[PDB]
Amino acid sequence: NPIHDRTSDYHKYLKVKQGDSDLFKLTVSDKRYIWYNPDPDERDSYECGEIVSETSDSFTFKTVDGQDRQVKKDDANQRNPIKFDGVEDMSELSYLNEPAVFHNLRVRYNQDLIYTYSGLFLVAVNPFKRIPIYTQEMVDIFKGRRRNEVAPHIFAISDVAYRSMLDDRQNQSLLITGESGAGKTENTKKVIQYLASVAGRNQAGVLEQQILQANPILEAFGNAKTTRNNNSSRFGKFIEIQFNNAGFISGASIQSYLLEKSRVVFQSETERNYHIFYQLLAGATAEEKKALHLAGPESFNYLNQSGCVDIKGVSDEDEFKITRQAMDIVGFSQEEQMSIFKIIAGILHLGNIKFEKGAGEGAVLKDKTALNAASTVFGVNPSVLEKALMEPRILAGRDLVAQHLNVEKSSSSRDALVKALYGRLFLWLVKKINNVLCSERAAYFIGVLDISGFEIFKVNSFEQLCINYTNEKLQQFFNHHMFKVEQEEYLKEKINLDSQATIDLIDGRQPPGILALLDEQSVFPNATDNTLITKLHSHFSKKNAKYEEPRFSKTEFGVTHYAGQVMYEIQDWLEKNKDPLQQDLELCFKDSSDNVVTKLFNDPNIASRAFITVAAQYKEQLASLMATLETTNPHFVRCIIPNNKQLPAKLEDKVVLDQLRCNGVLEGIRITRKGFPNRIIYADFVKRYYLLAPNVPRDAEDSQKATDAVLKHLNIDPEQYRFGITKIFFRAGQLARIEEARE
Numbered sequence: 001n002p003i004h005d006r007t008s009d010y011h012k013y014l015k016v017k018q019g020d021s022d023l024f025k026l027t028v029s030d031k032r033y034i035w036y037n038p039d040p041d042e043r044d045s046y047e048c049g050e051i052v053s054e055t056s057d058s059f060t061f062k063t064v065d066g067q068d069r070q071v072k073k074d075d076a077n078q079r080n081p082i083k084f085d086g087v088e089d090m091s092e093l094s095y096l097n098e099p100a101v102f103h104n105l106r107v108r109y110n111q112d113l114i115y116t117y118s119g120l121f122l123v124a125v126n127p128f129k130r131i132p133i134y135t136q137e138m139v140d141i142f143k144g145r146r147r148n149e150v151a152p153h154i155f156a157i158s159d160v161a162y163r164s165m166l167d168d169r170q171n172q173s174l175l176i177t178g179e180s181g182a183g184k185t186e187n188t189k190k191v192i193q194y195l196a197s198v199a200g201r202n203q204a205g206v207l208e209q210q211i212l213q214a215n216p217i218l219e220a221f222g223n224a225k226t227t228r229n230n231n232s233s234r235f236g237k238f239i240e241i242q243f244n245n246a247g248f249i250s251g252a253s254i255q256s257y258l259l260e261k262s263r264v265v266f267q268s269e270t271e272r273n274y275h276i277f278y279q280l281l282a283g284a285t286a287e288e289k290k291a292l293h294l295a296g297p298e299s300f301n302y303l304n305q306s307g308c309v310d311i312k313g314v315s316d317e318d319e320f321k322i323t324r325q326a327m328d329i330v331g332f333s334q335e336e337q338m339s340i341f342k343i344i345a346g347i348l349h350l351g352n353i354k355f356e357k358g359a360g361e362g363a364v365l366k367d368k369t370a371l372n373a374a375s376t377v378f379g380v381n382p383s384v385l386e387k388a389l390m391e392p393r394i395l396a397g398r399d400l401v402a403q404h405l406n407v408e409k410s411s412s413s414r415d416a417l418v419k420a421l422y423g424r425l426f427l428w429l430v431k432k433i434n435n436v437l438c439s440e441r442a443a444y445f446i447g448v449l450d451i452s453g454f455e456i457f458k459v460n461s462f463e464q465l466c467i468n469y470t471n472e473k474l475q476q477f478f479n480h481h482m483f484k485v486e487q488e489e490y491l492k493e494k495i496n497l498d499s500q501a502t503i504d505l506i507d508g509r510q511p512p513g514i515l516a517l518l519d520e521q522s523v524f525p526n527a528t529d530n531t532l533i534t535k536l537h538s539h540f541s542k543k544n545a546k547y548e549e550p551r552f553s554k555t556e557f558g559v560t561h562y563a564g565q566v567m568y569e570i571q572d573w574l575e576k577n578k579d580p581l582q583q584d585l586e587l588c589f590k591d592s593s594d595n596v597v598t599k600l601f602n603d604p605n606i607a608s609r610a611f612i613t614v615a616a617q618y619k620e621q622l623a624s625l626m627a628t629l630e631t632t633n634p635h636f637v638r639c640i641i642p643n644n645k646q647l648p649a650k651l652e653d654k655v656v657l658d659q660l661r662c663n664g665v666l667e668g669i670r671i672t673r674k675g676f677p678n679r680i681i682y683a684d685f686v687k688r689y690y691l692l693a694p695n696v697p698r699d700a701e702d703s704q705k706a707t708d709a710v711l712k713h714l715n716i717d718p719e720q721y722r723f724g725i726t727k728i729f730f731r732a733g734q735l736a737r738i739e740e741a742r743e
């Protein structure tokens with residue numbers, strides 16, 4: 001058993017190394033320590049101070065410098081006894097303070113132990129290097145083991161979910177959140193690999209392969225290199241792994257949320273557009289290139305503006321293969337693939353269209369190359385296109401009259417088109433995939449959510465509000481859930497909100513919240529950004545406690561979110577909400593000779609939102625998501641980024657701690673710390689502590705009687721612990737004191 005074979009890779013890579021002895025006296029120490037901030041300005045920066053003396057109410061310790069200081073006992077951040085460094089669950093910690101928590105994570109990370117539990121959560125810190133803990137051999141060790149039986153791992157929470165499903169006949173969910181680059185998508189892919197393996201029907205299976213090939217397809221079209229991650233997911237996703245009554249994988253379905261369409265037409269410096277563009281340019285066959293009027297990235301406006309066309313240690317040509325191979329496995333025909341390619345190319349050509357003026361104020365196409373290129377690949381009438389771009393007919397109530405747009409408006413229109421095409425294509429892909437894997441008649445499911453946690457940038461826009469509104473809801477669900485689950489534990493053992501207000505501000509109908517007001521402004525063609533922001537301040541400024549009207553800025557507003565205050569900039573919200581496309585453009589494309597192209601514009605499912613705004617739509621998708629989640633038994637994973645530099649072996653204190661504060665980890669410890677944080681199995685207590693009392697023997701039947709014995713020996717406050725049917729519950733700091741007692 002690799003599990004009890006101290007020489008196995010399991011032991012080397014997932015466990016804290018065990019020596020020849022386990023004796024209590026090993027860890028004996030005379031010193032006591034306290035975590036302190038050497039600079040009170042740097043609050044997340046701590047050092048360990050050794051305690052020297054104590055008054056009845058305060059502690060006096062020695063700094064690193066050799067300097068002496070004092071602290072109130074009630075404010076002190078005591079350091080846990082060394083026996084606690086590296087524990088697998090932060091819940092076993094006696095002193096539960098911020099520096100203590102950070103420290104356990106750190107001790108673990110130093111030994112490359114990236115996974116740690118924190119009560120209900122599985123905390124996962126990005127290693128930024130490969131650790132061989134995801135092999136088939138690793139998968140087989142985790143099959144059927146209880147949480148406590150094995151080391152923390154994504155595979156373990158995945159197995160727990162699976163056993164619960166079979167045993168309770170209840171659907172399950174895994175929520176994996178955290179910042180960009182924290183490791184969400186990596187862990188998500190591990191869940192799927194694990195499941196496909198433990199629940200798949202292979203004697204060597206097709207379904208299983210298809211399911212596995214699904215994400216690569218989506219990552220090509222929805223991931224991009226950003227400054228925070230070379231493989232950023234520019235969309236949220238919910239994966240439902242479907243099973244039959246017997247527990248075998250039977251299908252799957254995918255839901256996507258919020259694709260960043262704007263990146264297709266603009267990228268920040270150093271970033272890239274979606275991977276596919278590069279993959280196509282790099283691996284199209286010489287025949288494909290000519291058929292697509294293809295060239296180099298440098299030759300395309302949508303690709304030559306960031307200053308970055310490739311990713312280090314990444315071959316777009318080689319990635320292309322992988323992409324195409326997945327499409328093949330999944331079921332896309334050569335034609336369908338072909339058409340996808342034409343679309344991707346066409347978008348590139350549209351991007352090179354240059355509008356010039358002079359005539360007057362109207363726009364003109366002196367050059368017509370690119371137009372022709374795109375026309376061709378799209379299978380549409382170039383002249384129609386031209387006209388639909390520069391001379392859209394607009395409805396003036398009675399009159400349907402074609403407007404002659406200036407270059408700007410003409411450009412912006414082409415851009416809206418590109419965005420419409422890309423976004424529709426992505427939905428088509430997802431629907432396609434779902435058509436192949438989705439089983440109408442599934443018995444049970446395990447759903448995995450891979451989405452960002454709270455987003456707080458310099459500039460926060462409409463997209464960030466959507467994300468933060470999602471996180472307010474997820475966080476609330478977490479809080480409801482932990483509440484029940486702690487309450488249930490106390491019961492089994494026989495021992496003795498703010499969220500809503502922010503949510504209401506956002507999505508309330510009466511009084512109307514932010515989204516309602518935005519939607520209302522959305523029916524007025526002539527409404528502007530000022531109109532809208534004036535309306536928000538009118539309703540909430542000095543009127544809603546979660547809102548803040550800035551002292552000087554006239555284009556922003558603040559929302560107090562769970563993770564802190566966020567300032568939103570209103571620019572372009574109206575447009576974003578309406579996501580407008582000229583009808584003459586829709587007409588142009590409706591007539592495509594291309595089979596997929598046509599679908600993008602003729603299937604209400606892909607072409608239309610429902611008249612629904614973008615906010616309203618989102619609101620609805622969130623509500624269905626939440627509804628499903630509410631029917632599952634949830635599992636929470638929090639992915640943590642170690643630093644903002646993408647480096648291994650560099651766990652930065654402030655970076656980490658900020659994260660732990662935003663994602664709810666610290667609050668749960670806070671909550672937990674309040675009651676009886678430590679809950680030890682009677683038998684286990686005795687094993688270690690029998691020596692402390694001139695009475696008890698390590699091995700006993702009446703473990704409780706034993707436990708009581710020691711407690712009594714040491715003369716411990718009956719308020720410091722509660723007797724449970726199986727566990728002895730301990731208040732914060734108590735266990736540390738015991739550990740601190742002499743043999």
Ligand SMILES: Nc1ncnc2c1ncn2[C@@H]1O[C@H](COP(=O)(O)OP(=O)(O)O)[C@@H](O)[C@H]1O
Binds near residue numbers: 131178179181183186
């Ligand atoms: N457990 C891990 N082992 C190895 N590399 C990882 C791990 N977690 C994340 N990474 C790395 O960090 C990069 C960012 O991870 P990713 O899953 O894409 O983050 P997220 O989806 O949270 O934005 C990955 O492309 C990979 O290099």
Ligand code: BEF
Binds near residue numbers: 178184185234452
């Ligand atoms: F960049 Be990660 F996908 F949030």
Ligand SMILES: [Mg+2]
Binds near residue numbers: 185186231232
């Ligand atoms: Mg991702």
